[PDB]
Design a binder for this molecule. Structure first.
Ligand code: MG
Ligand code: MG
Ligand code: MG
Ligand code: MG
Ligand code: MG
Ligand code: MG
Ligand code: MG
Ligand code: MG
Ligand code: MG
Ligand code: MG
Ligand code: MG
Ligand code: MG
Ligand code: MG
Ligand code: MG
Ligand code: MG
Ligand code: MG
Ligand code: MG
Ligand code: MG
Ligand code: MG
Ligand code: MG
Ligand code: MG
Ligand code: MG
Ligand code: MG
Ligand code: MG
Ligand code: MG
Ligand code: MG
Ligand code: MG
Ligand code: MG
Ligand code: MG
Ligand code: MG
Ligand code: MG
Ligand code: MG
Ligand code: MG
Ligand code: MG
Ligand code: MG
Ligand code: MG
Ligand code: MG
Ligand code: MG
Ligand code: MG
Ligand code: MG
Ligand code: MG
Ligand code: MG
Ligand code: MG
Ligand code: MG
Ligand code: MG
Ligand code: MG
Ligand code: MG
Ligand code: MG
Ligand code: MG
Ligand code: MG
Ligand code: MG
Ligand code: MG
Ligand code: MG
Ligand code: MG
Ligand code: MG
Ligand code: MG
Ligand code: MG
Ligand code: MG
Ligand code: MG
Ligand code: MG
Ligand code: MG
Ligand code: MG
Ligand code: MG
Ligand code: MG
Ligand code: MG
Ligand code: MG
Ligand code: MG
Ligand code: MG
Ligand code: MG
Ligand code: MG
Ligand code: MG
Ligand code: MG
Ligand code: MG
Ligand code: MG
Ligand code: MG
Ligand code: MG
Ligand code: MG
Ligand code: MG
Ligand code: MG
Ligand code: MG
Ligand code: MG
Ligand code: MG
Ligand code: MG
Ligand code: MG
Ligand code: MG
Ligand code: MG
Ligand code: MG
Ligand code: MG
Ligand code: MG
Ligand code: MG
Ligand code: MG
Ligand code: MG
Ligand code: MG
Ligand code: MG
Ligand code: MG
Ligand code: MG
Ligand code: MG
Ligand code: MG
Ligand code: MG
Ligand code: MG
Ligand code: MG
Ligand code: MG
Ligand code: MG
Ligand code: MG
Ligand code: MG
Ligand code: MG
Ligand code: MG
Ligand code: MG
Ligand code: MG
Ligand code: MG
Ligand code: MG
Ligand code: MG
Ligand code: MG
Ligand code: MG
Ligand code: MG
Ligand code: MG
Ligand code: MG
Ligand code: MG
Ligand code: MG
Ligand code: MG
Ligand code: MG
Ligand code: MG
Ligand code: MG
Ligand code: MG
Ligand code: MG
Ligand code: MG
Ligand code: MG
Ligand code: MG
Ligand code: MG
Ligand code: MG
Ligand code: MG
Ligand code: MG
Ligand code: MG
Ligand code: MG
Ligand code: MG
Ligand code: MG
Ligand code: MG
Ligand code: MG
Ligand code: MG
Ligand code: MG
Ligand code: MG
Ligand code: MG
Ligand code: MG
Ligand code: MG
Ligand code: MG
Ligand code: MG
Ligand code: MG
Ligand code: MG
Ligand code: MG
Lengths: 62, 96
RNA sequence: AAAUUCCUUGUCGGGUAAGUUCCGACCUGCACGAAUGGCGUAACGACUUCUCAACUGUCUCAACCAUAGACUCGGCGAAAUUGCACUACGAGUAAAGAUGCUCGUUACGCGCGGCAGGACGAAAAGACCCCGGGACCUUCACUACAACUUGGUAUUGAUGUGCAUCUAACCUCGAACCCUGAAUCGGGUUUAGGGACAGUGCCUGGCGGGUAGUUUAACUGGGGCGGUUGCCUCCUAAAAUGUAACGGAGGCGCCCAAAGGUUCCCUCAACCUGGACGGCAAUCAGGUGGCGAGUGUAAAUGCACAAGGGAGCUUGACUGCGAGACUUACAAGUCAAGCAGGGACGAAAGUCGGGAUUAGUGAUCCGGCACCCCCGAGUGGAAGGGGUG
RNA sequence: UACUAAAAACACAGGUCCGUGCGAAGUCGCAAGACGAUGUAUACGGACUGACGCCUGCCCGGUGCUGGAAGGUUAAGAGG
RNA sequence: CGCGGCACAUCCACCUUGUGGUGGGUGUGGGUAGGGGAGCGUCCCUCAUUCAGCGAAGCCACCGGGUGACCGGUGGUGGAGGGUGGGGGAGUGAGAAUGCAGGCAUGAGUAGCGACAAGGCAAGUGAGAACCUUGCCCGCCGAAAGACCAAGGGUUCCUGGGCCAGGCCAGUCCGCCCAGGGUGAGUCGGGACCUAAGGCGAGGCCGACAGGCGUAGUCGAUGGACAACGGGUUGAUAUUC
RNA sequence: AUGCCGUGGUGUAAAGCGUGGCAGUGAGACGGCGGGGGAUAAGCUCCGUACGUCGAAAGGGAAACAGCCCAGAUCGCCGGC
RNA sequence: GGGAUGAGCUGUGGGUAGGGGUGAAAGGCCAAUCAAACUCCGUGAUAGCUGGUUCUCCCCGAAAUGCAUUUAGGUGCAGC
RNA sequence: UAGACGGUGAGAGCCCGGUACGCGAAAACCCGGCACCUGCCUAGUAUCAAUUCCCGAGUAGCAGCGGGCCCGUGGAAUCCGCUGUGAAUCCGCCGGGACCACCCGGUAAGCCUAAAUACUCCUCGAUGACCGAUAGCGGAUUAGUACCGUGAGGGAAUGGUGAAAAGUACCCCGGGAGGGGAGUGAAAGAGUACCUGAAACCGUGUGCCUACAAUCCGUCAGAGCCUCCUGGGUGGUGAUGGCGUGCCUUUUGAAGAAUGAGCCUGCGAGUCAGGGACAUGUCGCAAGGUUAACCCGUGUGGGGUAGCCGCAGCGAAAGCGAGUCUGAAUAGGGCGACCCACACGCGCAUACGCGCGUGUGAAUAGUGGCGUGUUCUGGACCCGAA
RNA sequence: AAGUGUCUAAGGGCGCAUGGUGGAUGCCUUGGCAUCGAGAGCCGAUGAAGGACGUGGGAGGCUGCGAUAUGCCUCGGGGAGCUGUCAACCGAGCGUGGAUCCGAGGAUUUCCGAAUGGGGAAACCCAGCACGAGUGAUGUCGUGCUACCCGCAUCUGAAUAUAUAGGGUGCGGGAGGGAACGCGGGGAAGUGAAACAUCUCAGUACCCGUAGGAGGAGAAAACAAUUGUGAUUCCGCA
């Protein structure tokens, strides 16, 4: 048969132009009142998946 | 991962939606048009499909990477601003 | 004092030479009690329990006899078990109980009849216990369902004033007749009743261990019971960091519209001396006093240069960012100069992205709200989705 | 309790309570139908107790069961 | 440390100075889980080549060989397929799974040889006799250890043969093996008669389907009805001839 | 005192680091040293230790004797220290 | 040893069937099996558990720790 | 035009059956043709005009509850079932993913319809880098048999003399069985217990050792005997001395008195599929690479561009684009582009170089094939529950 | 006197030699397995599939056949042997006047089985009617027909009048089986989710109905989106 890509991983990770896998960061969905803007801005945007999560994340996306 | 919430569940979904109605353009750059058409002349969607810079049966847009030294008359779909700039600077024309 | 009494062989009496048992009582009933019956009760019992007579090899304490085996011979001829093998003992040693290792000791080789101490002998992948799974059982565990039940609506109509009446739907395991020759079936016809009710369909609430599928945490000096589970501070912690125990101690799940920002000013506690109510300790004055006070809140590290005390004005308890770091399995967490916008305070320099610092918290999912107008399933919208908060 | 338990367990005659007015209630069946019973409350079913004798006290707060419907709450339906 | 063999890594110098070889250094080479590398053996296919009834495979013995898996030679046995090399492909390697199948050990010439009625002698048969035959003694059952029927079994019945299996020993005997034979009904037990419980069930009623139940009816003995006795005879049947 | 961080020299082949493929392991034991728990008991238990050994390490010593002492087995030798 | 005219024993024929039967009730019995029979099928059920996993040599060679965990004899990532 | 295959006393194109090839059918069935037969047409056509009527009902729609679609009820469209309500006939009705308008498309509630698709109890004809008697079907053999179970069901084991029975006449021992001699046969070192004939296991003969010794059964040292060859060397044995705690699993640690194994022989466990995924080795082509279905071929060959991957990224997206997103920012950040070695050619630096172009990498850079490791979905290394 | 000094095997070990057991190995094969290319894709009340019991000169099994019983008839083929096979022995015969054997068509075809006259423990029992055979006549034999339901056509038309239900008759048809494939309907669980209920497994297994050589689908209340395609199915993509 043909391999099925993991749905949740496909909605939580994507690849960049050079193949890096990126992700957004947790703790920005709610309970934002007490979180100062420095923390929310640290949590904003996308980061490259950690080097030692890379293998499992690639396996999930592939 | 042994029972802790996995990596594919700890993190939020990527934001946004995908546009069902997105128009995808095959890409040609004036640099590679210069490369494939050194003498210039009429340049068509079919012509540069045939020369292999673009996939067939797709809307193609011209982008402005590279140099243009060729008097070129390129007929594509939805040029780039820099693409028209250097196509006309080389003396050619850029037409939908 | 019990089929119930833990203490307990309670105590008293009886029975015995001697009675944790027995019988009769006492009542101090751990924890009796009236149909999960209470207390009695003739008869009954292969029931339990205690006593006596008789009787006896049950015993003192064994002996002898016969038979069936055992044993011998001839015939037939298995079995469980089995890593091996020319398989001693002692004291040791060792996975802590040794035929097999050590050091000694003992022992000619091989059979036969016996015994049962060991070979942790054989047999059943321990029933106990724990861990994982299952099964069945229970219930005020969860979620369903059957059954039962409620109303609406269809079947389902008429007339009057929900109620009543009516009859024609529908119902009748009331009756008679016919199919029917044989029929306590069935159906049809007629009749006698009931009657728009009931029953049934769809929708709907209730009820529902009757049934069903399941869940019912882990740590743990075994498990259970008890305690604990996240965060912060200290000690353990061996002078970087880190470091375990059901090790030793405490805190937190907030609070503050000022207890935030800024500018300026100040110095405490305690002690001594004097002083109306006023005293040891209220306020006052003078000394002395460098931190023994205070710090919103635990502890630690800090803070007298104050971060401690007071006053003025304020909202930076900002928006867009963020080089570079700390920490870290990851996810997270933490610090950050500096740039810009628009401000606060300040004469300026400057400081301000909450609070002396470190707890006061919760990923993702799924949703909500406000804004932006990003997408808008033929098109314009819209629905819905998206982004930002 | 065939095959470690024969009992003090079960049953029992007797008792009481509850249900059942009759294709009853209960039960087996999706139903038809059947048993109940060719019975009819002195009957049938369920529950507990367990010959017989003397008796069986208090509590209706909880949970059930029975009855009642003044009010509160509420589903579908209607309504809009 | 000495002397000799091997291997791995790395370095330096010659040879088409990296496909890499050669020489020489230097260092290294215990190893479970595990990683990496390189090989042995079996089978099948293809290509080439070469053996084979003057003897292939397989097996056995002996002599040799390689660093290992293993290999070769010689001889014996045997009777039809092998060897080598370039490749290709695996049902490709067992010592363990209380693994599976078969064969065979150990226990062991051991336990046991199935009721506590009890055998004996003489004669016979026979290759062979405790067990078979005959006679006679002795003992045992006799509310069965006797005689029958039903169910069940199925030829075990009789005769004549047999005796390597079976019979818990042996066996000449046998319910064993082989062949042939043998079972005779108007009345017996059943049906052709009857119905019970129950079963099936025309139509039928009910039920999405499947099907459930059931009327008529039709089955269904363990029951009802229904006519035979005594004797004789065969090796084997008899209320049957 | 050690240990730790940085740095400059010196030394040291099989250091280190990044990034991929494939792991296994995540029951440890004892001994030394520093500690907790315990009774400053345990072949106890729980930590620390660029500490060791066993695990996965044969050889020699310790009578025997995983974990102590010596020493890490490429093969051969009827050589030596 | 118990019953042995009875709630007796027994033959023949029949009926009740698996979440079902039947049970003077022991969770007894339903073909030597019963807290849900047996057979076939789903099916090669699943098992974080136990066991087993077969030729060779050469080089290197661990770990039994941290973090998290319905987790603690499992597993992910880190460490090696 | 026959060298397919099999048999025949051992590898046969020429010995046989056959094979290439060529013929062949009373009848039956199948196929096709011609008739015969049956049915339809021989009366409509065109235009005008749009006044009238026609288009399939308890259906659609709507509401409820469900089912099904990627859609697990969600704003739920389309489709299906039941319940209720319940239309209209074209100036109608349905769909275009709530809905509305416009526009587009189509005519539900009647039916029938070949071919391309699926399958093989069965019949022929072939085939196999399939099995070869514990394999291959359970079944080469009484095979769904024996046997087991009341029953549903379960369910075996057992092939080979030889080329030819020439299957051992006759004699002898023996009751037979069995054997010996003869005889047949190439062989009885094929005797219906039969091809080959391993191991376990069981004897018999024989060399050495062994009845004063405590033995994981060996190993090293080692005398002596025996044997066979030239004091010496083989081969056998091993008095005597030392050393020496089975194998596996699993464990911190087992010789362990933890597990498993009586023995031998045979069998018994990381496999296969997929344009799967990742990484690698290798090969082809290379800014390209490659086809899938399918088509045509006796094949493995030739076609086949649909598609896939590469070719530009950034952004939620509109979009922009070597940039892009955030942002007020000609701020900062995020992601992305600056693609390789050797060579020449240019617009030229004295000849040596920035850029840009040919080329040559036939690993460039991708892409496709093949190998390997891992992985995914499948029973997925094998065995095992309740 | 003291001392040293062989030798012995009840049995056992090791190694050879020579046998036995056993049935591995090797090599085979009237057997399987997986395919490919063609066919044929149904059989059954005119009685099927599948059986029971019989049938041969010799006993049984297989196989063939059905009381006409390893067989009957006809039409073809073929040309010398034959009387099938376990499975030898015989016995008895047949065959160029064409056997055995092969192909096709027919005849016969017990009993059971959908089983269907009725009954039944399948392969057994008991009939009725009609026509024959047989007896002195009852007995007895042979051959047909006799289930139920459905449809059609005719006659009749209960209670009860119209009528209908029902009943009579005559024609037709159905029933059951089959390995897979189809369609419609009903529809698990184990399992996976490291628990589990949504979800999965899976519309799978299984079941019910029902076919056909295939089936289903099929001729737009279709898609699509400004030019468009034009029934369905199936394959590859997407
Ligand atoms: Mg948000
Ligand atoms: Mg905020
Ligand atoms: Mg007492
Ligand atoms: Mg007392
Ligand atoms: Mg007393
Ligand atoms: Mg009471
Ligand atoms: Mg009582
Ligand atoms: Mg009694
Ligand atoms: Mg005696
Ligand atoms: Mg004896
Ligand atoms: Mg001894
Ligand atoms: Mg000892
Ligand atoms: Mg000892
Ligand atoms: Mg020893
Ligand atoms: Mg003895
Ligand atoms: Mg013992
Ligand atoms: Mg034991
Ligand atoms: Mg166990
Ligand atoms: Mg309740
Ligand atoms: Mg109602
Ligand atoms: Mg209603
Ligand atoms: Mg339950
Ligand atoms: Mg489950
Ligand atoms: Mg626990
Ligand atoms: Mg405890
Ligand atoms: Mg520290
Ligand atoms: Mg320190
Ligand atoms: Mg607390
Ligand atoms: Mg302030
Ligand atoms: Mg202050
Ligand atoms: Mg705030
Ligand atoms: Mg930053
Ligand atoms: Mg400013
Ligand atoms: Mg100012
Ligand atoms: Mg700042
Ligand atoms: Mg604070
Ligand atoms: Mg979730
Ligand atoms: Mg739109
Ligand atoms: Mg639309
Ligand atoms: Mg909106
Ligand atoms: Mg933002
Ligand atoms: Mg008992
Ligand atoms: Mg008893
Ligand atoms: Mg009573
Ligand atoms: Mg009453
Ligand atoms: Mg009732
Ligand atoms: Mg009561
Ligand atoms: Mg009682
Ligand atoms: Mg009372
Ligand atoms: Mg009350
Ligand atoms: Mg090594
Ligand atoms: Mg070494
Ligand atoms: Mg290894
Ligand atoms: Mg020869
Ligand atoms: Mg020879
Ligand atoms: Mg071979
Ligand atoms: Mg050899
Ligand atoms: Mg040879
Ligand atoms: Mg040979
Ligand atoms: Mg070979
Ligand atoms: Mg080859
Ligand atoms: Mg190969
Ligand atoms: Mg194998
Ligand atoms: Mg073996
Ligand atoms: Mg074995
Ligand atoms: Mg065996
Ligand atoms: Mg013995
Ligand atoms: Mg004996
Ligand atoms: Mg006897
Ligand atoms: Mg005599
Ligand atoms: Mg007597
Ligand atoms: Mg008498
Ligand atoms: Mg006899
Ligand atoms: Mg006889
Ligand atoms: Mg005999
Ligand atoms: Mg005998
Ligand atoms: Mg009927
Ligand atoms: Mg019936
Ligand atoms: Mg009857
Ligand atoms: Mg009868
Ligand atoms: Mg009778
Ligand atoms: Mg007789
Ligand atoms: Mg763990
Ligand atoms: Mg641990
Ligand atoms: Mg530790
Ligand atoms: Mg210590
Ligand atoms: Mg310890
Ligand atoms: Mg230590
Ligand atoms: Mg050691
Ligand atoms: Mg040592
Ligand atoms: Mg020693
Ligand atoms: Mg010396
Ligand atoms: Mg008696
Ligand atoms: Mg008595
Ligand atoms: Mg009596
Ligand atoms: Mg109990
Ligand atoms: Mg039983
Ligand atoms: Mg169950
Ligand atoms: Mg399954
Ligand atoms: Mg090493
Ligand atoms: Mg959790
Ligand atoms: Mg890991
Ligand atoms: Mg040939
Ligand atoms: Mg609807
Ligand atoms: Mg739906
Ligand atoms: Mg229409
Ligand atoms: Mg139509
Ligand atoms: Mg059709
Ligand atoms: Mg078709
Ligand atoms: Mg075919
Ligand atoms: Mg064939
Ligand atoms: Mg077989
Ligand atoms: Mg039987
Ligand atoms: Mg002879
Ligand atoms: Mg001879
Ligand atoms: Mg001769
Ligand atoms: Mg020979
Ligand atoms: Mg043999
Ligand atoms: Mg032989
Ligand atoms: Mg001696
Ligand atoms: Mg000793
Ligand atoms: Mg020795
Ligand atoms: Mg280990
Ligand atoms: Mg242990
Ligand atoms: Mg052991
Ligand atoms: Mg032992
Ligand atoms: Mg164990
Ligand atoms: Mg064992
Ligand atoms: Mg994108
Ligand atoms: Mg940028
Ligand atoms: Mg390449
Ligand atoms: Mg392969
Ligand atoms: Mg398994
Ligand atoms: Mg063989
Ligand atoms: Mg047909
Ligand atoms: Mg025959
Ligand atoms: Mg026969
Ligand atoms: Mg006839
Ligand atoms: Mg003829
Ligand atoms: Mg013929
Ligand atoms: Mg014929
Ligand atoms: Mg019949
Ligand atoms: Mg019948
Ligand atoms: Mg009338
Ligand atoms: Mg049919
Ligand atoms: Mg489930
Ligand atoms: Mg699960
Ligand atoms: Mg699981
Ligand atoms: Mg069709």
């Amino acid at each position: 048969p043909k391999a099925k890509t993991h749905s949740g991983a496909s909605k939580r990770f994507r690849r960049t132009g050079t193949g890096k896998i990126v992700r957004q960061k947790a703790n920005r969905r709610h309970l934002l009142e007490h979180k100062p803007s420095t923390r929310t801005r640290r949590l904003d945007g996308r980061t490259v998946v950690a080097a030692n999560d890379t293998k499992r994340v690639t396996s999930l996306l592939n | 991962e042994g029972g802790q919430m996995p990596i594919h569940m700890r993190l939020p979904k990527l934001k946004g939606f995908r546009n069902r109605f997105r128009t995808e353009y095959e890409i040609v750059n004036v640099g590679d048009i210069n490369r494939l058409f050194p003498q210039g002349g009429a340049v068509g969607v079919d012509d540069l499909v045939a020369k292999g810079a673009v996939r067939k049966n797709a809307l193609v847009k011209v982008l402005g990477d590279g140099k243009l030294t060729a008097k070129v008359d390129v007929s594509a779909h939805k040029f780039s601003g820099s693409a028209r700039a250097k196509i006309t600077a080389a003396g050619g024309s850029a037409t939908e």
